[PDB]
């Protein structure tokens, strides 16, 4: 798991931030150019707090599948000059299952924390907070509030973003290459 | 830092537990035989909760130096049949400074979490919660309540146990080989 931690630490350092919306505090992962991702339930407005700074949101897309089923991801285009390091190469084309993953959080409640969550399984459909949701990845860890936007990784792979939990399992939305063109 | 995470994960799995005393919830590291360590301020009584179990404490020693100066460590002898894996080989004879360390926590507030804290420096004397305290190791991380008993490690080294913080820095008491005979 050493390499999985090592990759995760470098990825959070280069591409992650702490974001506040009206709906809470989240980890945010920048993907390429000025595009980043949040759990859909963060419900970013015209403005967000990004590491304490008011940042303008030029575009936001709540992702759904071809049937309109919720995927629980919102892509957002940031009004800022810096671009993110392009990490689309680390995103799979389809849901990845691994035996050992690391979930990385960066919030006030959990600043620079890394959790080895064990096996990730393609969970599939989940009734999440009452909304039918697809392309969930599941891991047996007691995830809690303050961990949404959590980045789920293994060595050289970004698997998904943490979006919910039932007190005993956690769930990430799979972060697929085609979401980013 | 990969190897430092890898060592830390294996060490917590084999030798750590979650302990409640009247004074809070702590990470506890077992050292050898039935001997473990807590921050002195956990103030373990005749009985502690060890992973939800009432466990008897046969002996407890609050460590002080040759002048009687506080070291902020309490060694405790547990009344249980299992012995800990002997990890005295990973303890230094004197305070270790490293460039990259991992602090590992295992509580309800922070179950199986690992934090890369950066450089550890021999801090020396510290007025901790009003008590003169020696042999502190310092790292620049915003440590919080719920992280005491936190185990500070680098590759193949157990450096100390987290005992306090000022909101911007954290401090571990050095865990020295001679404390354990
Ligand atoms: C992240 C928010 C954050 O960072 O805080 C800002 C400061 C947070 C993390 C999760 C909370 C608890 N565990 C976590 O990991 N995510 C949420 O709170 C998320 C919000 C949300 C998502 C989508 C729409 C609207 C809001 N909500 C939940 O995670 C949700 N849990 C849930 O839906 O559980 C699924 C269950 C399920 C599916 C199918 C069949 C049966 C069941 C079932 C049975 C019994 C319990 C759960 C489930 C919240 C609202 O939690 C409960 C469990 C109360 C529903
Ligand atoms: C661990 C407890 C835990 O797991 O909770 C159970 C559920 C906790 C972690 C630390 C809290 C905040 N940051 C942490 O990492 N440890 C303590 O609370 C610890 C308890 C204690 C230790 C020893 C005797 C009695 C109680 N207390 C503190 O960490 C303490 N901080 C402190 O003393 O700071 C040192 C400062 C210092 C030294 C020399 C010169 C000047 C200063 C200075 C100036 C200004 C601020 C701090 C210091 C607590 C009580 O915090 C404050 C900062 C309020 C004193």
From TrEMBL, chains A, B:
Gene Ontology terms, MF aspect: cysteine-type endopeptidase activity; nucleotide binding; RNA binding; RNA-directed RNA polymerase activity
Highest rank taxon of the organism: Viruses
Any GO BP annotation: proteolysis
Keywords: Capsid protein, Covalent protein-RNA linkage, Host cytoplasm, Host-virus interaction, Hydrolase, Magnesium, Nucleotide-binding, Nucleotidyltransferase, Phosphoprotein, Protease, RNA-binding, RNA-directed RNA polymerase, T=pseudo3 icosahedral capsid protein, Thiol protease, Transferase, Viral attachment to host cell, Virion, Virus entry into host cell
Subcellular locations according to the entry: Host cytoplasm; Virion
Principal location listed in the UniProt entry: host cell
GO cellular component, one term: host cell cytoplasm
Segments forming domain Peptidase C3: 2-180
Family recorded in the similarity comment: Belongs to the picornaviruses polyprotein family.
Binding partners and assembly: Interacts with RNA-directed RNA polymerase.
Record's protein name: Genome polyprotein
Species annotation: Coxsackievirus B3
Organismal lineage: Viruses, Riboviria, Orthornavirae, Pisuviricota, Pisoniviricetes
Section covered of the full-length record: 6 to 185 of 252
